[PDB]
Symmetry: C3
Subunit: 248 residues, 3 copies
């Protein structure tokens, strides 16, 4: 996959692009020449002092039959000289910066890659908007069933968070592939539960709950399809989301 490999290449390149040492600007040239020509490495260099927290490729554009542009988010520390020092003895302030760098990449017939031009500062990602949609369905109205389903779901979550797969599987429909959270959390309680009847024997439980990790509570939200079988209510599915639900 071209995009997959281009993303890793752009991330690697970006790591070096934002790693800069005025204590030796040729170090940048040595490192960057692994990705591009000497001429381009020199053009890209400057007097910045910076190092890297992460690089993450976020957007892909096919530009021609052998060229792509990959936009990369880099979290970086940029060190600026402290005030009143108007080189080897400079004291610095640390600036935490997120950069968005568009990386032009050429590839050959063997999928070897090079950065083929100056990278440029580009637009950050833009958040999607969504209108919340509460579940549209018929609330389960029988109090006996509601309590039974609720206790089953509660016991299931205790096992999901705290117990092994063997113990968990007793709560599940046959072949429901729901693996536990690795016995790494203490289940506190269900904070909110709403139950809907889907069909004669199937129900949706929409659940807000919290668990502890290392002494602090973490909120969680799920929906679960639950199946009535005999005296039992067994878990068929486990999904995140408590609204904007799609059961298809």
């Amino acid at each position: 996959s071209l995009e997959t490999q281009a993303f890793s290449f752009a991330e690697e390149f970006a790591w070096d692009y934002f790693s800069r040492y005025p204590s030796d600007t040729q170090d940048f040239v040595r490192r960057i020449t692994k990705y591009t020509t000497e001429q381009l490495a020199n053009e890209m260099n400057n007097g910045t002092y910076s190092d890297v927290i992460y690089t993450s490729a976020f957007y892909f554009e096919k530009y021609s039959e052998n060229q792509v542009n990959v936009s990369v988010k880099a979290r970086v520390r940029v060190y600026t000289p402290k005030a009143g020092q108007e080189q080897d003895q400079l004291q610095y302030d640390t600036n935490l910066v997120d950069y968005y760098l568009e990386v032009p990449i050429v590839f050959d017939k063997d999928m070897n890659m090079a950065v083929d031009a100056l990278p440029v500062m580009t637009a950050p990602p833009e958040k999607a908007y969504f209108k919340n949609k509460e579940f549209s369905g018929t609330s389960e109205n029988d109090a006996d069933k509601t309590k039974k389903i609720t206790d089953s779901v509660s016991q299931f979550f205790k096992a999901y968070y705290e117990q092994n797969q063997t113990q968990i599987d007793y709560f599940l429909v046959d072949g429901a592939d729901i693996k536990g959270a690795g016995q790494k959390f203490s289940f506190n309680k269900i904070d909110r539960i709403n139950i809907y009847k889907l069909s004669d024997k199937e129900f949706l439980a929409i659940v807000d709950l919290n668990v502890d990790s290392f002494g602090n509570a973490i909120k969680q939200g799920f929906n679960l399809t639950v199946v009535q079988e005999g005296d039992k209510f067994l878990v068929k599915t486990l999904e995140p989301r408590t609204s904007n639900i799609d059961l298809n």
Copy 2:
């Protein structure tokens, strides 16, 4: 593919901020997380945890609807817990232990027509990767056991590996079948020796060598295992293929 690739990076970026928490200024988390989600969800996700991040790695993709996906992310994190005996100590005076923790976070993502993304619900703790089963199956073939020929193949393979680890491509090429595309390891290791070699005859003048060997990097030995197809040219054996694995081999 493109949706999954971009969703992976988005979930990893989100997870980095999700697991960076500073209880002295919880608004910092809200500021950062609001880049990905609503200010309401940002506040719902916040807590009193103190943690920072080593890595985030998206490992599983689920398509949920026409415009929603779920991406599971492994985050290696440091969680700071107050040292024992500070139940009565003011928060700003606390001393901390460091806990190294791997978390597995399922991130629900919505996208619009332009493939802009947002986290559309609380992320939840999910199952870790489960190891696949495997069991070694030794290569099934005809062993080559002639003393001198075994000596000759072992010497050719030993010479090839010294080149593969230590020498330039020009030097490596002398040991290869014409046009075999086998590039060396970048001259960054000292080849020590072959520790084990088992040889099988594949056809006239073609053999499989299954090799355990070790090399040095910065004064410590690292074990390596390969299988190589070699072609007999007189006393010399030229390398046709080089692959990892010394069992569960597939020559097709």
Copy 3:
């Protein structure tokens, strides 16, 4: 996607494979057993002291119906004892730091449920190799009219000042209606255009090829773009914005 998943798995594994603490060798076995058998985890262990900066999968090979090989670049620190310490107790050792990029080929097995494991010793492999390219200057016809080149230049300069410094409402004034061109987030100071060559593509449509520089935290950084610019009345509006100042493809 198998490749996408195998890439992530290989990266995670390589992170542990290059994290080694000789005062606690069992720690490596514990961590590596998350990916492979305890026997193979031990076979992979040694007395190295090392930790990890990044891991990045770069190459994928399908090996069989249940096996792949993923090559991973790992940037690592390897700590080597300073001189004179051959007989010094482990816990008193002083170290030098070696910055190293490793290229690790990771053999992975996958099952019908796409669970994965490392099924063999990983091996040191070949680093990536750069693509070579011959630079091609843009092939079109220069626009030479003084008035028109001045107007285009001034419009492009104003556009870039907004692109780097201003909000989208301001940038939109310089764009063809509908152009999908978002600004750089107001985080740079636009300095000047350093080089501009203008070409006529058709009636009232031009390509500007531009070298410029901007400031971030007190230092200048060079940028290169090509932009399609269209005449509307007496104005010139920006229609496209792409990196590259040569090897250009307008299709």
